[PDB]
Amino acid sequence: LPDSVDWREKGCVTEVKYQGSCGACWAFSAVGALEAQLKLKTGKLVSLSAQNLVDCSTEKYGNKGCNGGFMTTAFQYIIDNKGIDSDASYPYKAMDQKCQYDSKYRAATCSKYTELPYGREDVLKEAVANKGPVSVGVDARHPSFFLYRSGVYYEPSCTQNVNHGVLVVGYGDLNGKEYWLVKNSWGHNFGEEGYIRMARNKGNHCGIASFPSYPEI
Numbered sequence: 001l002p003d004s005v006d007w008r009e010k011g012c013v014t015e016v017k018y019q020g021s022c023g024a025c026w027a028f029s030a031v032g033a034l035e036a037q038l039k040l041k042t043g044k045l046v047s048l049s050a051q052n053l054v055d056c057s058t059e060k061y062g063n064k065g066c067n068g069g070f071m072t073t074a075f076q077y078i079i080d081n082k083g084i085d086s087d088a089s090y091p092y093k094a095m096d097q098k099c100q101y102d103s104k105y106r107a108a109t110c111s112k113y114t115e116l117p118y119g120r121e122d123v124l125k126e127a128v129a130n131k132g133p134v135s136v137g138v139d140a141r142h143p144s145f146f147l148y149r150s151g152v153y154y155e156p157s158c159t160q161n162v163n164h165g166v167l168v169v170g171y172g173d174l175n176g177k178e179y180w181l182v183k184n185s186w187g188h189n190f191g192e193e194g195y196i197r198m199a200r201n202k203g204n205h206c207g208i209a210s211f212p213s214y215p216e217i
């Protein structure tokens with residue numbers, strides 16, 4: 001395995017999104033992972049519709065729109081639905097709405113997803129290096145996460161109980177402090193211009209390897 005990876009250098013990561021007051025983190029995390037696989041498959045980097053998940057990957061998928069949901073069940077929706085719309089055709093509104101999916105605006109498909117074994121940061125590393133960005137849950141229920149500005153994040157009261165969906169788009173180290181490079185959906189002013197570097201190989205810190213998954217086109 002490489003010591004460091006950044007999928008942004010590979011042209012596989014779209015712009016940071018702003019979820020606002022709608023708890024659609026899980027939606028953005030899911031489309032983020034599929035965006036990278038879309039680029040790898042087709043040559044096109046295209047922001048996919050988070051809103052489509054919020055409106056359509058709903059009760060049947062155990063999801064609750066702006067009050068939270070699961071990346072894995074979002075992927076199954078895209079599989080079952082035979083498509084997800086582009087973000088251009090179905091833009092983000094930060095609210096729960098009626099499903100407005102239309103196949104005429106399909107930007108991606110999904111054929112399968114893979115759920116990584118619980119707490120294994122080495123298995124996560126291998127997936128990030130070799131497959132693509134990986135959707136992850138983390139514990140973001142601490143003020144230090146909201147206050148994060150720069151560097152490698154480490155919260156000693158962090159648990160392995162995850163409650164916020166994000167996207168691991170790389171890993172590396174800062175002067176020997178190992179990190180996961182995380183794309184969040186709290187807009188381009190959060191942390192390092194949309195990103196947070198989270199402690200890696202620190203005993204599954206904030207549950208970052210608790211529930212990892214990735215899709216395939």
Ligand SMILES: *C(=N)c1nc(-c2ccc(OCCCN3CCN(C)CC3)c(C(F)(F)F)c2)cc2c1ncn2C
Nearest residue numbers: 023024025026067068069070071137162163164165211
């Ligand atoms: C995002 N803005 C947001 N996210 C959540 C939320 C709650 C719980 C979550 O994970 C549940 C544990 C993992 N499960 C995966 C599927 N398995 C079958 C069962 C276990 C997540 C997740 F998936 F990690 F991202 C997110 C709640 C939110 C929320 N905004 C507002 N609320 C209440």
